[PDB]
Design an enzyme around this catalytic site. Structure first.
Site, PDB file in Angstrom:
ATOM      1  N   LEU A  27       0.822  -1.220   0.000  1.00 27.12           N
ATOM      2  CA  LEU A  27       0.000   0.000   0.000  1.00 27.12           C
ATOM      3  C   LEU A  27       0.860   1.276   0.000  1.00 27.12           C
ATOM      4  O   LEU A  27       0.641   2.161  -0.826  1.00 27.12           O
ATOM      5  CB  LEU A  27      -1.014   0.007   1.174  1.00 27.12           C
ATOM      6  CG  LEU A  27      -2.020  -1.146   1.233  1.00 27.12           C
ATOM      7  CD1 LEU A  27      -2.832  -1.097   2.523  1.00 27.12           C
ATOM      8  CD2 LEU A  27      -2.935  -1.168  -0.006  1.00 27.12           C
ATOM      9  N   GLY A  28       1.810   1.349   0.933  1.00 27.80           N
ATOM     10  CA  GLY A  28       2.740   2.459   1.082  1.00 27.80           C
ATOM     11  C   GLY A  28       4.160   1.952   1.179  1.00 27.80           C
ATOM     12  O   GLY A  28       4.381   0.759   1.403  1.00 27.80           O
TER      13      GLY A  28
ATOM     14  N   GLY B  16      10.053   2.131   6.191  1.00 26.95           N
ATOM     15  CA  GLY B  16       8.941   1.255   6.552  1.00 26.95           C
ATOM     16  C   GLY B  16       7.849   1.142   5.497  1.00 26.95           C
ATOM     17  O   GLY B  16       7.663   2.047   4.664  1.00 26.95           O
TER      18      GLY B  16
ATOM     19  N   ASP C  22       3.893  15.832   8.186  1.00 29.18           N
ATOM     20  CA  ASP C  22       3.808  15.294   6.821  1.00 29.18           C
ATOM     21  C   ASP C  22       2.418  15.466   6.218  1.00 29.18           C
ATOM     22  O   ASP C  22       1.938  14.603   5.486  1.00 29.18           O
ATOM     23  CB  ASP C  22       4.301  13.832   6.740  1.00 29.18           C
ATOM     24  CG  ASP C  22       4.950  13.467   5.404  1.00 29.18           C
ATOM     25  OD1 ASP C  22       5.165  14.384   4.575  1.00 29.18           O
ATOM     26  OD2 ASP C  22       5.276  12.267   5.203  1.00 29.18           O
TER      27      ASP C  22
END
Ligand SMILES: *CCC(=O)Nc1cccc(CNc2c(C(N)=O)cnn3cccc23)c1
Length: 265
Positions: free
Chosen positions: A12-13, A14, A122
């Protein structure tokens, strides 16, 4: 959450992976988003868990638990994915009132993060997830910091695209609730450009722009800013201009921005 019952699907996206929590082992279990470390990084990851486990907002990605086996962070999975790509895919469907709804929820979520003394560091459209057509949630707490009771700022060099940084973060690595407000101004700009690549914060700043970080900082100190997105309501552009105040103390708070965004709908 037994590690042996977490079945890998994709990335999906350490890193963050899409897994199915399948106790029956029959492919009928619920889908979850699981984050793992791929030293000091172990301390960074433990911190992320504690921060997220203590957050409870309709506008923050939901913590589910931790995994156990021979540690991973388990969170809810939002099939729609990031706000950046969703805005690009549904451009023709979302109008200025829907963009203001997304803006309001993000702001309400940020209001709650600051109440918990949490600085996100972020905040950007790529890092916001879509629950439904009318519901957005703040995610990616990998750089989140907790402010001590005695301090209102945090002193950290950043590895994120430089176009969402407040000048005090660029020039001195100072991070606060007020640098999150600067970033938020960039989120509104991203929303009203529908995250269009050709007029993206990177595209437009690099055209307007010694090292790059220094050039961007020289530009921002001069009072230069990103232009109003094409067909942007003026009131919205005036709010972005308020979030981009040179001094952190002159930027509106999330609780001040909230009613202003709701009033526009
Ligand atoms: C726009 C590209 C992208 O996917 N960006 C992104 C932003 C924030 C977080 C993630 C990965 N995480 C994630 C979760 C979660 N709980 O962290 C949940 N649901 N989804 C769906 C897609 C990605 C995620 C990626």
């Amino acid at each position: 959450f037994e590690e042996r019952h977490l079945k890998y699907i994709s990335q999906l996206g350490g890193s963050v992976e899409l897994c199915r929590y399948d106790p029956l082992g029959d492919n009928t279990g619920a889908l979850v988003a699981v984050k793992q470390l791929q030293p000091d990084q172990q301390r960074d990851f433990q911190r992320e868990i504690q921060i997220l486990k203590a957050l409870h907002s309709d506008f923050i990605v939901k913590y589910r638990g931790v995994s156990y086996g021979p540690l991973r962070l388990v969170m809810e999975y939002l099939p729609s994915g990031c706000l950046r790509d969703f805005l690009q895919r549904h451009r023709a469907r979302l109008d200025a009132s829907r963009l203001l709804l997304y803006s309001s929820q993000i702001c309400k979520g940020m209001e709650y993060l600051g109440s918990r003394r949490c600085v996100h560091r972020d905040l950007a459209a790529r890092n916001i997830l879509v629950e439904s057509e009318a519901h957005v949630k703040i995610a990616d707490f990998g750089l989140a910091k907790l402010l001590p009771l005695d301090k209102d700022y945090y002193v950290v060099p950043g590895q994120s695209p430089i176009f969402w940084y407040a000048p005090e973060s660029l020039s001195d690595n100072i991070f606060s609730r007020q640098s999150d407000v600067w970033s938020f101004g960039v989120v509104l700009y991203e929303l009203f450009t529908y995250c269009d690549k050709s007029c993206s914060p990177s595209a437009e700043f690099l055209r307007m722009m010694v090292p790059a970080l220094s050039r961007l900082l020289e530009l921002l100190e001069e009072g230069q800013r990103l232009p109003a997105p094409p067909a942007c309501p003026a009131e919205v552009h005036e709010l972005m201009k308020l979030c981009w105040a040179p001094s952190p103390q002159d930027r509106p708070s999330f609780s001040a921005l909230g009613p202003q965004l709701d009033m526009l709908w």
